[PDB]
Nucleic acid binder design. Sequence first.
DNA 1: AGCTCTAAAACGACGTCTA
DNA 2: TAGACGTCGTTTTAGAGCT
RNA 3: AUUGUACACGGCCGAAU
DNA 4: ATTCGGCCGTGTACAAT
Lengths: 51, 416, 35, 36, 468, 144, 188, 48, 48, 48
Amino acid sequence: AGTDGIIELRDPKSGAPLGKLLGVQVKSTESGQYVRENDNSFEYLLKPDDL
Amino acid sequence: SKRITDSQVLGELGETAIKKIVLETGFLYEQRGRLEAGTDGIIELRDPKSGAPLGKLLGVQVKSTESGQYVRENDNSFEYLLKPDDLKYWRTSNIPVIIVLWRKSDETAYWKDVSDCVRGEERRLKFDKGTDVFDPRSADRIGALTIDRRTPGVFLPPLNKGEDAIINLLRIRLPDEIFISTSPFGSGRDAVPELVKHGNVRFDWVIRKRRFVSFFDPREYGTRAIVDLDQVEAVDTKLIAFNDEQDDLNDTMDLLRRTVERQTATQLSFLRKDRLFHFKAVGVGKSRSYRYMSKVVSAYSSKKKDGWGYVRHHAARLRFERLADEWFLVIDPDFHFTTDGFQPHRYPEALLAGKKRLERNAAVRGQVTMWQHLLVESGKHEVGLFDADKPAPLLQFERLPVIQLSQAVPESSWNR
Amino acid sequence: KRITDSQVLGELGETAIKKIVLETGFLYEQRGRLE
Amino acid sequence: SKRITDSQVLGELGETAIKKIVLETGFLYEQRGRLE
Amino acid sequence: TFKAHVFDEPMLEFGDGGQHCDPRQGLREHGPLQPRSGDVIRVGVIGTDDTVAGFTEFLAETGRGIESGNKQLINLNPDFPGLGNQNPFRCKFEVPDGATVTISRRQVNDITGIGRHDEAVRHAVELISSQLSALVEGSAKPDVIVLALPIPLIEKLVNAKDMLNFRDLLKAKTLHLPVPTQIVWPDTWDDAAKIPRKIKRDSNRQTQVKATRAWNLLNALFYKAGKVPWRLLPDQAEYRTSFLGIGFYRDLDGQQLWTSTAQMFDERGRGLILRGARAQTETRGRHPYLTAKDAEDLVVQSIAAYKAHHRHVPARLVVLKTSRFRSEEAEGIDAALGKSGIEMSDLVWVQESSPIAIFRDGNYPVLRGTFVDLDGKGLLYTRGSVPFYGTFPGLRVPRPLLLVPHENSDSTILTLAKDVLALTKVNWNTTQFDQKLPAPIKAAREVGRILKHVEFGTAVSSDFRRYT
Amino acid sequence: DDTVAGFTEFLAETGRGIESGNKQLINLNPDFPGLGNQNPFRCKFEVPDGATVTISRRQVNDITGIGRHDEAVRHAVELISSQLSALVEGSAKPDVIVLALPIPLIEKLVNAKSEGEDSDDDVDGGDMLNFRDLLKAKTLHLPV
Amino acid sequence: IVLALPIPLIEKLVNAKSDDDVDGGDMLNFRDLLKAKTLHLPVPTQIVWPDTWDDAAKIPRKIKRDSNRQTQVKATRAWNLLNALFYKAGKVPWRLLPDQAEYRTSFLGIGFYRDLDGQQLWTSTAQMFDERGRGLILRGARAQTETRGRHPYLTAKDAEDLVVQSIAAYKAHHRHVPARLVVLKTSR
Amino acid sequence: LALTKVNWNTTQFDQKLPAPIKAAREVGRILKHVEFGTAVSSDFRRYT
Amino acid sequence: LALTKVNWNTTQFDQKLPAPIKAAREVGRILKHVEFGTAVSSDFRRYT
Amino acid sequence: DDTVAGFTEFLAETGRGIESGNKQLINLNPDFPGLGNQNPFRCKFEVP
DNA sequence: AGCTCTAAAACGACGTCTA
DNA sequence: TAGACGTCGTTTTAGAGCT
RNA sequence: AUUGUACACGGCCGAAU
DNA sequence: ATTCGGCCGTGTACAAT
Ligand SMILES: [Ca+2]
Ligand SMILES: [Ca+2]
Ligand SMILES: [Ca+2]
Ligand SMILES: [Ca+2]
């Protein structure tokens, strides 16, 4: 699907799961170099269908 | 040793069973791992027309049961008590959460939004066995919870598998044989009074351009004085009925309507100023009822009221069209108003406008089915069941196959 | 993107089979995304 | 009232780390469900 | 048998590439397709002082926002966002100082004193048109002029105390003024005021909720200001097409029948030109069809209008008519196409009186956009249950459109139905997108009402701003 | 556009499977299985959008309006070759191109009878041009 | 298809040294002859010398027999070669960004080339126009006309038949004649 | 100037000649050896 | 007899003629209109 | 067989990325990215 | 300082009191 | 009869315990 | 006439007897 | 007169089950 995982919040003190979900998509690269990557910043181009 | 008790496998059986139900509905299920906190899965909506995942999620909690009865089960509804800790966790969620109950004994699944409290009791839900069933028929209802109805601009594409709709057409099975002749009479109207003196009135005949045509042989069951016997040579119906000439279309349509009138003459009266077929009223002030199939349904074809009153005969505008060299009949539901049931009413404005305003698609569709049942039955074999003085009807009407619609109206979700 | 009806059919079959194994008495473990 | 103790989170983290190590090796790892 | 199909709702464009299926919602998110230059749309008002002040506050009342008239259906009866960052037009409507013309009580009493309704209508038209000229020539210079008719005038001009129609006569007699007009009754901008009906004096006029009224009225004002609100989203690779709707209107005497045409085509870039025009030469007759010679001239004029904007003849020409295409019209149209070298052509008769219908189990009608092929004749449900609205917004039962293409049609009925269904969403006179008729067909009829009083040979503006 | 839409539906219809014409001889007249386990080619026959070229009614009337059959065939070949050239150099290049000839074009090119008075039927000549053979010969340079 | 010519074959075909006496100096060009003779094949072909995919390889020049040819750096060679390979595979890499309000235009370039006999002059033309949607068509055609001479210019009839052919090619994709037609020519 | 950036034979965009002019010359080199009257593909991929 | 079952123009395997004979006649129909000395593709998919 | 194997390695070599030939002018002489997310053609050049 | 049971959390239904 | 409270089953790690 | 639909009424047209 | 086809114009009810 569009997302690759769901992050659910949880209070680190009491351990109570807050129930708030958060979609996550993960792009994995192997020894790549992002577009216009300096030593402090870089860019990334999202696919139009993902938006 | 290690044991996997029947309770554990049953609990996993329910989660798999609900996933199977969701998947065949068309959505996507998302089983949560060991760290589930009260939601047994996540449901993502999908568009059945295009297959695109809609991206709207909702939590699922599944509570299985091998056998037994829920709280206050009465074969119509039951209740379920929610654990307070579960209810508190579900409230904090930013997505809707639905609880699904699965019973192994009768392999049934019921669903309900956890926020659908009954009688103000927050931790009690009241199911309904006739409308809370978990299955593909409820796809639109599930997706409706994923949006806030209070904010503008939120909507869901139709999620049902599809529907089936009637076409409001009746296929006409014409007899393969048509009786044509070059009658000496110049016009049809001129020959009408001449028929009365001779007798043997049938009135399924149309003559124009000095040429005669009918489905019945004029030599019997009808008069002969209007035609010359030598030139009466019977020919196949396909030669004139499906012939491209415009004049051959007009007489065929006129012949079809006049033929239809005799077949339904037992119950239908054909008005002339308005080309309207209306149910004839037996008894001046006696309302009628006609029964038709779908199931046994009795509709008040003739209805009368108090005061000076009127008689609301159910009416139709029967019209004939030719499609793909095959003749069809169109039913246009309408109403006819009469004071004593025989002569027309004089101010049917408020009655027609008042009556037509109220009915909806459900009522209009019922009238189409009623008329379709009547015309089909009116031409059936053995309708007279005598083989003499009542021959088999010439025209056979059969319902078209039901039209298949890919998308379906989310009518169930539109409850107010 | 899109999810073809054949793609969801495969998951329906695996879920149907997993359902069949469960009341048989055994245990079923659906494998990961890798085929 | 619902609580996810650090023990369960630590166990899940250990399982995830072992799966990550296995995938770094080049093998395939399948995680068993509730009925493990 | 008969094969069905349910078209998805065509997508619209609202500037900056904004795409949505709902005009009013699409305007909220992205704004108008063509952004208005400046930030204020100056609106002139003509009427009695109470009507002028009553409408002036209504424009301000829209700035603060109007609460949704039915919370159950906020997609069908949405709120008006107001002057915030969600302004549907990204502009504010003002009645600038000096842009107000007042009809005196003596002037109003002068109109109502005339016994003859037709004579009173003509006397009112020349009075109002004179006041229109003063507003245009003055330093105010509005963009759109609103005529707020007082209740006594409405009781006289519309109701009694064939006959002339005040709106059609007024629009025709002001076709020579640059600023478009807009008639508004007091019921629109004030819930307290009630106007009795014509035949039934006891009954009042039932109107939509104020939020819906503000959506439709201000959209018309914005369009009449000079900017196109929205447009059909163009496909990636489609033929450069021109749509020509042909309609007929009764003559003033009530016997003869003229031909009124409306043409819609995409402009170069972001735009949608809607042109209302009349046949240059009309042969006297009562015929609801066309002659081979005049049908040729209508196409030739249509091609020239398209060629003026694009500098190339259209690739495909779609002709929509209110009556069955006959052999004389088809061969007349073919002659004009051969002269201009148009490759493909469609000739569709948009019939609304067909008795064929479709019914489904349940209390709601079939979905909008459902199509069924009938031996090459299309049964399109341009109106029906709308999933976006959550209901079917209408009376008893929607009546489907029967599309009967001529034999000289290049495209299939499936493609034509999709185009016809899409054309129903570009009627800028309203924000509700479930219109029964396509815009070229509807605009042709609306043009005919105004042109009924315009004398033949008079040169009039082809802009649809003056007829909507 | 009638033939293009008609043939495109037929390709989808073969995907759903077609019942055998003669059940008595199920080997000589089998049934097309369609998509599934028994898909004969293990592939879907789809017509991608933008891979269709429509012959306008004026273009068909241009071919039918030519008196001599041999001239009409040659004119038709040049017309189809131009459309074929545009289809192979477009963005959506197909694997195989299907020429779904309309009924009027077949009548004029194969049956060689014109709606008006027929010229080449009156003057038979030594032989007659074959549209199919000439079209294949004149499109040998095209890659599809 | 990539034709990776070996070094000994390049020496014979290009440098012609392995040379015989010069006869007119109109030596055949292997690349142009190969491209022409395989125009009936359905797959485009690409010629690649060894020194582009291998920095160690060195082919001496034709006349300057003591010097190798100098080539661009390996990264630049990979950029140009793979872009050509992608284009010949059947897809357009990039296109000019079109202005929203622009006339539908068709570009027609006209050029001339010496005949194989070295005296006569033929006309070769190329046409550029963007198809409906995201695409760009570049056609290459020779004027189907018989007016042979040495003039580096067209005749009245020759140009008319050439422009008509270009318009018809445009009308095949757009189904409408272009709004603008820009003709670029190498001679006055 | 815009036409110089669509030659497709090189990734360096500072081309001197417009593409239609350049493409015409590239077609000419191949067509010297193609005898007149022979039908050939108009695709530029066969000449670049 | 074996060569009669490789006529890919049809799926009915009982064919009266071997494929080399059948294919040689099919290319004759197409090459009838091709001028001599003009290079044409030898692929049989262009002739079947 | 030397050039066929030699060019095939080059196609795979471009997949791994080629360092720029002149870092002083990184725009005139850029480095070929390879098969990462910066793949200029989003496809693999392979010899089957 | 090792084992070993023992706490502590979660989920899965299902008797049992407890009214 | 409903209805938490409970026992039973598992994982999960970590502690107080007897040693 | 903010907006259109549905219904009701009325007028008229095209082809042949 | 009929039988088939169709069209345009002015009013009310209603805001949608
Ligand atoms: Ca679970
Ligand atoms: Ca308006
Ligand atoms: Ca090159
Ligand atoms: Ca074949």
